[PDB]
């Protein structure tokens, strides 16, 4: 569902909707299948978010995703890919 | 004389590459008296002038801080 709208949503409603849920995603960014699935979705929505254009907290978020890949069952590989 | 001249060169470059708070600045402002060669004049005086002012300043170079995995973080803090 989401990526369909996100790839084609108006670049103004995009800003409003995301700015509504910036911290709502930052906090949740940090059995276990639920966690990895939610983070799947979070990566797959934040990438499309960033695809548009560039507050000041955003600087941190970069690292918060980088380590997410650098860790070294297939859901783990999908997580690294996302 | 010349032995302590090359010794002066060595100690000056050694303190230069050393980084201190109360660094050679105190030494230099008191090193206004013969911090450089004096055995044959001409070269002695010009070398003294060159060494008195330690010669320029310009910063460059990426990922050169402590703990490079924070150097990218230092690079990370450049967008706001």
From Swiss-Prot, chain A:
Post-translational modification (record): Autophosphorylated at two clusters, the T2609 cluster and the S2056 cluster. Autophosphorylation induces a conformational change that leads to remodeling of the DNA-PK complex, requisite for efficient end processing and DNA repair. S-nitrosylated by GAPDH.
UniProt subcellular location: Nucleus; Nucleus, Nucleolus; Cytoplasm, Cytosol
Function as written in the Swiss-Prot or TrEMBL entry: Serine/threonine-protein kinase that acts as a molecular sensor for DNA damage. Involved in DNA non-homologous end joining (NHEJ) required for double-strand break (DSB) repair and V(D)J recombination. Must be bound to DNA to express its catalytic properties. Promotes processing of hairpin DNA structures in V(D)J recombination by activation of the hairpin endonuclease artemis (DCLRE1C). Recruited by XRCC5 and XRCC6 to DNA ends and is required to (1) protect and align broken ends of DNA, thereby preventing their degradation, (2) and sequester the DSB for repair by NHEJ.
Disease in which the protein is involved: Immunodeficiency 26 with or without neurologic abnormalities: A form of severe combined immunodeficiency characterized by reduced or absent T and B cells, recurrent candidiasis, and lower respiratory tract infections. Some patients show dysmorphic features, severe growth failure, microcephaly, seizures, and impaired neurological functions.
UniProt family annotation: Belongs to the PI3/PI4-kinase family.
Subunit structure, interactors included: DNA-PK is a heterotrimer of PRKDC and the Ku dimer (composed of XRCC6/Ku70 and XRCC5/Ku86). Formation of this complex may be promoted by interaction with ILF3. Component of the core long-range non-homologous end joining (NHEJ) complex (also named DNA-PK complex) composed of PRKDC, LIG4, XRCC4, XRCC6/Ku70, XRCC5/Ku86 and NHEJ1/XLF. Additional component of the NHEJ complex includes PAXX. Following autophosphorylation, PRKDC dissociates from DNA. Interacts with DNA-PKcs-interacting protein (KIP) with the region upstream the kinase domain.
Annotated protein name in UniProt: DNA-dependent protein kinase catalytic subunit
Gene that encodes the chain: PRKDC
Full protein stretch here: 1823 to 1943 of 4128
Swiss-Prot record, chain B:
Superkingdom classification of source: Eukaryota
Modified residues (N6-acetyllysine): 9, 14
PTM field: ADP-ribosylated by PARP3.
Cross-link (Glycyl lysine isopeptide (Lys-Gly) (interchain with G-Cter in SUMO2)): 18, 37
Residues with Phosphothreonine modification: 63
Swiss-Prot/TrEMBL induction comment: In osteoblasts, by FGF2.
Span of the annotated motif EEXXXDL motif: 68-76
Cellular localisation: Nucleus; Nucleus, Nucleolus; Chromosome
Purpose: Single-stranded DNA-dependent ATP-dependent helicase that plays a key role in DNA non-homologous end joining (NHEJ) by recruiting DNA-PK to DNA. Required for double-strand break repair and V(D)J recombination. Also has a role in chromosome translocation. The DNA helicase II complex binds preferentially to fork-like ends of double-stranded DNA in a cell cycle-dependent manner. It works in the 3'-5' direction. During NHEJ, the XRCC5-XRRC6 dimer performs the recognition step: it recognizes and binds to the broken ends of the DNA and protects them from further resection.
Notes concerning its domains: The EEXXXDDL motif is required for the interaction with catalytic subunit PRKDC and its recruitment to sites of DNA damage.
UniProt similarity note: Belongs to the ku80 family.
Quaternary structure note: Heterodimer composed of XRCC5/Ku80 and XRCC6/Ku70; heterodimerization stabilizes XRCC5 protein. Component of the core long-range non-homologous end joining (NHEJ) complex (also named DNA-PK complex) composed of PRKDC, LIG4, XRCC4, XRCC6/Ku70, XRCC5/Ku86 and NHEJ1/XLF. Additional component of the NHEJ complex includes PAXX. Following autophosphorylation, PRKDC dissociates from DNA, leading to formation of the short-range NHEJ complex, composed of LIG4, XRCC4, XRCC6/Ku70, XRCC5/Ku86 and NHEJ1/XLF. (Microbial infection) Interacts with human T-cell leukemia virus 1/HTLV-1 protein HBZ.
Further comment: Individuals with systemic lupus erythematosus (SLE) and related disorders produce extremely large amounts of autoantibodies to XRCC6 and XRCC5.
Descriptive protein name: X-ray repair cross-complementing protein 5
Portion of the parent chain present: 652 to 732 of 732
